Homo-oligomer: A and B are copies of this chain.
Amino acid sequence: AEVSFGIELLPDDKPTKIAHLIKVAEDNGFEYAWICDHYNNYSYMGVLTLAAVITSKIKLGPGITNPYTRHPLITASNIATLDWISGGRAIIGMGPGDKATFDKMGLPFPCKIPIWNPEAEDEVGPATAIREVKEVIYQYLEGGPVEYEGKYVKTGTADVKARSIQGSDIPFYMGAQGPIMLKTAGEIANGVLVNASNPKDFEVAVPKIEEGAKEAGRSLDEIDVAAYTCFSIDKDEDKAIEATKIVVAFIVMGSPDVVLERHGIDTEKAEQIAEAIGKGDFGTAIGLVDEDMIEAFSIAGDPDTVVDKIEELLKAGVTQVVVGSPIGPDKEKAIELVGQEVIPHFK
């Protein structure tokens, strides 16, 4: 897979601002734009349809949605609709849901409910649910009728009228953190969205993606390994680094101990950070974030530093660098700084 840059925006801000930033990213050479799917924010279909209207080249899609909060045939319809309206630019980001959001919604997490197979009662693994949603979506994109009986979803004979433009050429990316999801993604996905920003995370993740690819007779180069990063760039390195703190603080808090161990993180001023958060004291949280946490969980600094860090990620197997929150002290100026002083070094 060729090297590319993506942008991931949480749609909590005004939809028109989110659309405007995606146009700035397109104008600056970014090739992918991912919009998160959480009920508490503006809906990905509304925000991406508005972004589709305001852009012409960048690929657009949910990053990431899930098999549970909407029937897979509804997700298929959304993707086909976004693809048609955008002139064939849709992409799919699919994951297993997320704990913080599912707890708020009232859904269990991991969610093992065979929600869309009414006659089943047996729990279903999230990786299996994702495989099934994928089959339903692509049967829909091929024009149907969709006929699928799995453990998590069982359809009737579902005819399809809506047509996309790319059809089954729409890329399927899977969110993956653990070994099971990483292996499944190497087997069935066009790409993998890994929430990580450091080469060490990919030295661990890529071999597992490759293991799944081999079992499917695929080469690792058929898979776009996308790093969903905490990213911060500014001509003033100190300012860029400072902007990452609140985000890194939350990352440190939600990182399993093997991840903290991997990055040699002060497990003391960790969780101690988790106590500052949840307590609503983000001020002490930010104060506790040190240089090792910033190096482990973000790509931050001036263009030179950022370019150096991306070179190391690419060596570790990353092929799509997704610029995520905070992006930079000023999001728009940050995107432009990436297009002007980072992307040209990788063309």
Q: Residues of A at under 8 Å CB distance from B?
A: 11-12, 14-17, 19-20, 23-24, 26-27, 39-43, 45-47, 49-50, 52-57, 68-71, 73-74, 76-78, 80-82, 84-89, 103-108, 113, 115-118, 144, 153-162, 165
8 contacts between A and B (CB under 8 A): A12-B161, A15-B81, A15-B84, A39-B73, A41-B77, A56-B87, A106-B155, A108-B118
Measured CB to CB, the closest approach of chain B to A151, in angstroms, equals: 13
Measured CB to CB, the closest approach of chain B to A36, in angstroms, equals: 12
Are A40 and B160 closer than 8 Å at their CB atoms?
A: yes
With A19-B16, A40-B77, A49-B45 as given contacts, are A57 and B54 in contact (CB-CB < 8 Å)? no
Are A106 and B117 closer than 8 Å at their CB atoms?
A: yes
Are A46 and B81 closer than 8 Å at their CB atoms?
A: yes
Q: Which of B27, B53, B165 contacts A54 (CB 8 A)?
A: B53
Number of copies of this chain in the oligomer? 4
Q: Which of B55, B77, B105 contacts A87 (CB 8 A)?
A: B55
Residue of B nearest to A162 (CB): B42
Measured CB to CB, the closest approach of chain B to A278, in angstroms, equals: 13
Further 15 A-B residue pairs, CB within 8 A, beyond A41-B162, A69-B74: A12-B161, A15-B81, A16-B24, A26-B87, A39-B76, A39-B77, A40-B77, A41-B77, A43-B162, A47-B81, A50-B53, A53-B53, A105-B156, A105-B158, A115-B115
Are A155 and B73 closer than 8 Å at their CB atoms?
A: no
- Please report the C-alpha to C-alpha distance between residue A337 and residue B86 in the assembled complex, in whole angstroms: 22
Residue of B nearest to A54 (CB): B16
**B residues in contact with A158, CB < 8 Å:** 39-40, 104-106
**B residues in contact with A103, CB < 8 Å:** 156
Measured CB to CB, the closest approach of chain B to A89, in angstroms, equals: 7
Are A81 and B43 closer than 8 Å at their CB atoms?
A: yes
Are B45 and A45 closer than 8 Å at their CB atoms?
A: yes
Interface centre among A11, A47, A104 (most CB of B within 10 A): A104
- Please report the C-alpha to C-alpha distance between residue A58 and residue B3 in the assembled complex, in whole angstroms: 26
Residue of B nearest to A148 (CB): B106
With A49-B49, A81-B15, A155-B104 as given contacts, are A161 and B57 in contact (CB-CB < 8 Å)? no
